[model samples]
Target: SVGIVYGDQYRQLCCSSPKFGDRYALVMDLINAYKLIPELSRVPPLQWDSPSRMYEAVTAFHSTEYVDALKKLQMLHCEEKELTADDELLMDSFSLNYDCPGFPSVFDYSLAAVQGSLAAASALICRHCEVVINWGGGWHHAKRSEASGFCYLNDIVLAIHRLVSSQTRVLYVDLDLHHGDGVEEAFWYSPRVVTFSVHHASPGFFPGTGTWNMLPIFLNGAGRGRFSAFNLPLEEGINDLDWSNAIGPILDSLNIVIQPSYVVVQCGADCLATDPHRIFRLTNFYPLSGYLYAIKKILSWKVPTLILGGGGYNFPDTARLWTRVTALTIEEVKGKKMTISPEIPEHSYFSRYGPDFELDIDYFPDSIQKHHRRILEQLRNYADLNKLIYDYDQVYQLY
Candidate 1:
């Protein structure tokens, strides 16, 4: 079956009083995305808060002790971090605070996200699903022992670990506007996992560790070492052309360095216009390109793959972008192009204000374009050396 995963619980956490639902303009944009294509629909209803269900999917990924700790700590910290306006004034702006409402009982925070991941993974395994989409998960910033970036558990890391237990090798790719810092940190030391990321490397960005990072693995009977973690940092306002440019080399080089037998891709959506942190001129299209490239590469290698949603905060953009991913997956693999139904599904969500909800060929800033082009030209010149097994693998091949 063609599978989709999403729900109200997906928006379970929000810092503001209005909650994310109060941010309906963003969420509705996601709803309208289904209008662009009809085959995409909300995930079918499942019983919520089932202890047995939780026991089945997530326990293997997180420890019961850690899970328990997560619950007790989840929302309790919100109360702990409570500060008076006077206290806030006393602190430096760089000093931060987490106003969590109540601490979860451990494993609960990741329980929700992991359930979403497993729900998607279940479809892929049981149904032999050709296309499975999980927009509910992809909380990429959570680390193994601590929650960060509003994320409680590193669902992506656990998912990779759980999946790698079943497969020989896995290729992990990130196409978020911000760096995929959490996953990078989780897998920075493992060579069995091939991790690739392309994101904003602009000055003064959060989690500034993607560029010049690598994980070394001892090969040749633990006598020799090889680089595993791969990162390509892009400048702000990166358009479609540059998006393709940065990802192409990394994936191509990954194929040569270590041909993975399976793949996982995290498509974060925060880089869209109007996002509080948007620095790149990226739309849902760029991430879709990454998805498409992964699919093609996986097919070439006969690898089963899992594509996931990451950090897109705009509801409509996530909706459209993910729908595009599902549509392309069906068309590319099944040889059937899926079309969006024009009529909006019930509640008919649409974005009131945000970036242009369409692919951008000419939307780049001129300065951004000039430097991006110059980078692409350099990549083009580099694509010729025969030390590599295949062609130069310029940036466009990623698209």
Candidate 2:
């Protein structure tokens, strides 16, 4: 089964809209505007709204001071209260002065994102859904104390925390244009959770910290040995063939080792060729071969999965990508053939899908980075280390 988390309230409260423009709202609008929800699934999306639950989820993973600062910022934004020197200091302290972009409901805005993501986890936990989509969540750059990269909260971390248990190993994969530093750092050394991030890594990429999990890549101490966290750093102008071919083996290899019972994917639309801040020359249309191809592969697996949104400056492109993702998910879950029409449906925002007005993005062709294959070869070495660790554990049966 497939479960989705969205609603009118979630749209209004989503923080991504104000910071990244109305892209968030427009995304929901496109998904709904196309009548993809109840028409296809015949089941309404999970609309779980609980402010107190949101607070508990946040405080459980974030600092009290940080949470309080978020609350103060929201109150100030709504109350029209003049910023005191202390309040200004608070905003600056959390890195909210710039990309964080202080706005009304700044703090309370994340409740929907959190609740929607949690709903995805809970749905999988209850065996109520084989796959869940929550494009409202996946704010990967947020930290425990400060909000960076326009994300006031770290819903991905909180949602993963919900999914992790003593008996389960969750594989967290971020396919965004940026490195999933916050998530990778969260379980950097945890033996239970394995994270694989494939993104654009340049000299000045935002956050600029998606290093490959090599160099002893220790999972639980003992440097240059274990394999837990991994990164597939790609150069700009990468195309579908290079990306899809490279990621397939890596994902299969990771699955061979981690044997994760569950998987979470962050599908930020910024990697699209049509994106304003596009990096990868990836496409999401018919004969899909880039990000959507990877998505199809992920959904092909039998593991319980949760997919969320991250970054994409282009609203129309983002909406189109997510809408196509929604259709693909339903198709996978239901074992139905959903041939996505190239023509964008006539919705309220139909004008935005102008020019081509199709449900696809161009895949800019370029020289394939030779580094991709090398990265995989390096990972094979790390995977061999895990082999050693497995044999050691088996021989010792160490308690």
Candidate 3:
């Protein structure tokens, strides 16, 4: 039987300083996210190495040119930073993370991320499991030739290339509040896969280029470029209901247009205000449900699928979303029961954000209350989804 596979060192990713070394929030949320499930073993494990060990994984799914550039960059960073074994290894391993202060070695993390993504794609093929979710695997901004915005290597693009090379028709769906510029750019003209993203793309944002002016979405024929890639640039602070509603039709529409052999969903938590960087006040649970619903649609066809993680800040929320999806993967496919655990980690980023890991049910945002009926309808709309899902219950109160 095939199971969910993740890089072993991913857990170590939490303790590493966010600005100087590791980002803890992501690690916290992911572990807690899985706690939402009843059975842990249902999630499979994969053996993999740190950023330095990424050389083998990259050959599995990246361009030699990009990989070489990253290596060169790593050497330069090592010289300047007075590198340690872990630092040097990280320079070669981790994908772009934290904006990561001191010397910019975020790209090193990108390499490992890409490798992890390819591992996910490979696992999907092996298990023939309709849907495979790879958390911590989408570094979308890494260009073909340059690294920008916390991305060293475009792991999602590389993974797609590897999968498409095998003649699989893949569809990439990005659910962050920002455009998936890298993934869309990589396969802009390819007929094998369709890439679509919904994000914040106003003038001041990072890599602001998701509008009609930047690039056209090609539907087909004369409208090929215009329709092929889809983008929904949203306003700041769209709630969970609106967020999910925003992507609903496109997802439904895609189900009709491209009944792909596999589907890749990028769930970047950076857009949420769960942390200081992103003030968008939506619960991690909502966008997660959006991805889960989409995954269900894809799996209904029994089409082999791979779900990859993307831009998520406030590590706790990031991990929370990933774990939610992981638990869902086990329940939806393996039919295992994963009850929420009471032993929530005190050090987790979520604990700092509020009272506990779960969303404060009594504390509804003003926006949600103002649009109460609309919100209620949207929340209730997922009743059908309820049969296949679980919720994160409230934990001990915070002082």
Candidate 4:
């Protein structure tokens, strides 16, 4: 019941993005080069004959104006010289100032993410698979009208909506360094879906929103977002122990309380130490820590889960962490033991994994000033979690 969506179009279109240029292709290359996955888990990329298929999916979560403007922007992007001053302003108008426009096929590239996520979501909804991965997806920062934070399209929203059955209940867990605001707002008032984001939050962060206070207001007595939204804001340099400890308890509670039938997790790699952004300084060190712990915990729920990718500026580490995640997901769902060699094999982009060309990306205790206290202090505000859990009204309101 685990399927990995990958193919010629998926990888090529994902690699065409400006911010994630070649990162998608490199990830698959590393996976191929490492030979971690078996053919059994591999699923063909979703197919669509009509161009409107993508536009239709994208428009579900975006404004018609924004979608048309975005398509126009991509066309103009390819012919930059022809644009006048008014055309230049259009870029800023549609939030194109982010990590977009640097590539010509912005629409197609962004659409690729939408397609892959939809493929995975479809697989889960139809019971074709219990766990699916479209690692190229998870663009959670893009808004209904514009882009933000390198996210030109909110593919996470598209996939979540795609998986939203009448009253099936969806749980979206965002582990990115940045807040999963786009999706958060998209379903902020929905009683049917619960979205949780655990990220670095401060006055100076790129998306400084998503504080603990947002949870209470939404989950209050008469609110539609009754236990439908959650957030755990953390500070910088948090070690794995502190990182996994908080996530484990909170998600454990939600998995049991909400009992979501479908789960979508955005595994953004920016939180890791070596990421160029230096946001959280967390690591995916195994046996109950970081990405491995969070992701593993979700899959252990034994529900249909869709795992997607998000912001991770460091390519090798992104590839490294995601490759490790793929291996983890494969073993869990396939029930097949895998021994992924730490020594990354030679490939087109193999040289990037250096200083130490091994597969594992670990963090040293000395390196990150453990912010356990910082995370705890912020966690103190969301202590209302206990009330929400036992509050019968919280669960009953959704139906």
Candidate 5:
């Protein structure tokens, strides 16, 4: 059985719109309808967490001054103090601007997500479940001392830190529309963790940092952990077959090298075609098309996994996809025969989107397939050459 890491506290995290809270309700409805409640564990309130714990965990990745500023901003009387020049510079350094507004109770909202992630990690470490789902904790754009792309804290980093305490090597996979920049940067020099991200690569894109040339530079002057990170920066409008082909080979190759003990997958739905957040033309018109492909591949590797959620602005669609994947995760974990149903229950929350409950989508023209294959093969060649360049670790022998 999988452990579900969620609580009504998630209600407090969404102040901008009610949809964020509503998504969880819709997911819960789907689980009950499918009779999957018996196969999962509900996350508790995590009473051990506190303001001091939050600050201590965050400081592991962020600067003390930056975390202190975030705490100060949480106070009601800090409004006038935040107007000072030094305070203004601190805010800018953290990128706490209009995109990442400091709304009322902002710190508490962010803390809820952090606590949820920590609980999920703890659940896995304590052997409470084979897999844990924290569908609200993939805040990947946050920096050590800064916030960007609406992320104030790097929950994934904090969670990985927890895992690394017990696991020797951890693999972090990002399927978000935007690159998992903060996670990559945090583990860039560490041999114990390897980060892989696939995202829309374009100039002037939000955060605009995860380019092809930004290969992993190992510490010790490139003598170790050189190929520890991999990024596949794709162009806009990539269809499903192209994505499947591109990622499968790269993942297989990375597993050969890293042979991770644990895996963390960031399942961000903004890459779907219907997402209004980014111009990604991914062919995920059907529910869980691209997202499920990634999850299925990771699970197939037989690694203990922690699945986290990232960016997805379309509330209903996002909820629908995660709910479907949750069901799929259970099926995979239980070793049950897996198949997409041909019909959506008449009263299912997502029946309207999939009238027939069919999971197939339209295929792209033959030319697009050939072009994407060419791009993918070229990228794989680069990875192969990179391994040859900095193949230092004996981790590959474990496989």
Candidate 6:
């Protein structure tokens, strides 16, 4: 059975805002309805960890001042108090703007996410489970102090830290349409953690910082962590073939270079064609090999893999895809031949939204092979020039 990590607070968090689709609830329901939960073991929920316990790990990456600010804001919000000038200033400093609005019980909700991630990471290190899934934990855009891209706390970073304490090396992979900027910056100076993100890098994209050239600049200084990060920024309207062509090669090459002891994959569904948040057109349909391609590569590493949820906006598709992947993770772990039904159960909770049946959808736009191929070539060149692969070869080859 897989180690499933979740908290009851997700239900309340979902209810707090319509922006948060019923992802956690819907995915949980589907997994249960499909009888998949019986095949999975539940991990200890982080809810019992308490705020002080969470702060111990969180403060490792975030500042004490910033943690206190979040606490103060949460207290003010609980009392139904309006933001004073000082409160507003702190909120802005923390980047808790409209993207991450001051929702009710915001601190508690965010803490649940942080604890769930930590629980999942702990499960992996203890060998209680080979694969752990935290559907609410992948807030990759969160900074140490400030929240960005709807992420208040960076569960991914904290989880990586936990893993690093037990293991020598960890690989962080992000498959969101938006870059995993916070995670990247958190480990920018640590060679022990290699952060790799694949996202759309258009000029006007949200939190527009990651680009191919950025890696070299970060590596130029005589820093031990230079070239420890890699970003594959693609153009908009990238379809399955192009996505597979681009990311497949990069991940294959990445494993050869990094040789990670553990893998953390942030599977964000917003890259799908029907996502409400982005202008890029990626299909969740089959033969459209977007998500599965990434998943398969993660599995190929044959290491302890931790999967976390990220920015997928279309609720139905998001829920279905996550459930499907949950089953897929089980199959890979058990080494059993399992295939999802293409026919949605008529009496099931999400009958209208899915056959719940197929892993791949039939959504693909015009072939952007040329565009992706060009991007791939540039990325390969960048990797070569920055000596990312070369340095790793030298370090590991000595052993």
lDDT of each: 0.53, 0.74, 0.55, 0.75, 0.69, 0.73
Which lDDT tens digits does candidate 1 get at residues 1-399? 345655565545321222133342344344444542254434432334776655554445444544455554445445656645664433212122252123333334445557666655555545466445565567677654445555566667766776666525667878777677777766666656767677777556776666543354211101111245555666766665566655565566555445565567787766665355667665444324444554455444444556676666555555555655666665565666556553334453433423343422223345434444444343333323212234434334533
TM-score of each: 0.68, 0.87, 0.71, 0.87, 0.80, 0.86
After TM-score superposition, the amount by which residue 360's alpha carbon in candidate 6 deviates from its true location, in angstroms, is: 6.1
Query: Which is the leading candidate under lDDT?
Result: 4
Candidate 3 — what's its lDDT? 0.55
lDDT per residue (tens digit) for residues 1-399 in model 2: 777777666767774447666777778778877677773422233443575655666786788888888888878887776889988998888787777766777775765677678777888887878888888889998888888887778888888888885168888889998989888877766656778888888776788786533443323212542456777777888777777865776676566556778899999988888788867877776565466787788877788998899988888888888888888888877888776677787877889887878777534452223444444444455557555232323222211
lDDT of 6: 0.73
* Best of the two (4, 5) by lDDT: 4
- How far is 231's C-alpha from truth in model 3 (Å)? 1.2
Q: What is the model-wide C-alpha lDDT for candidate 5?
A: 0.69
Clash count for each candidate, listed in order shown: 34, 2, 40, 0, 0, 10
Query: What TM-score would candidate 6 get against the native?
Result: 0.86
lDDT of 4 at 296: 83
Predictions: Cα RMSD each: 7.5, 5.0, 10.4, 5.1, 5.5, 4.6
- Off by more than 4 A, model 2: 39-54, 212-226, 362-399
Which rank order by lDDT, best down to worst?
4, 2, 6, 5, 3, 1
lDDT, candidate 3, 155-263, per-residue tens: 7886777677763567788876667777787776665667777777667886787664634431221123324566666778766667666666556545444556777
Deviation of model 5 at 296, angstroms: 0.8
What is residue 101's positional error in candidate 2, in angstroms? 2.2
Q: Report the C-alpha lDDT of model 5 over 45-140, residue by residue, as the tens digit.
A: 354557677667778788888777776656633354446677567677777666775655667666666778888888888888778887767889
Sort by TM-score, top down from the best: 4, 2, 6, 5, 3, 1
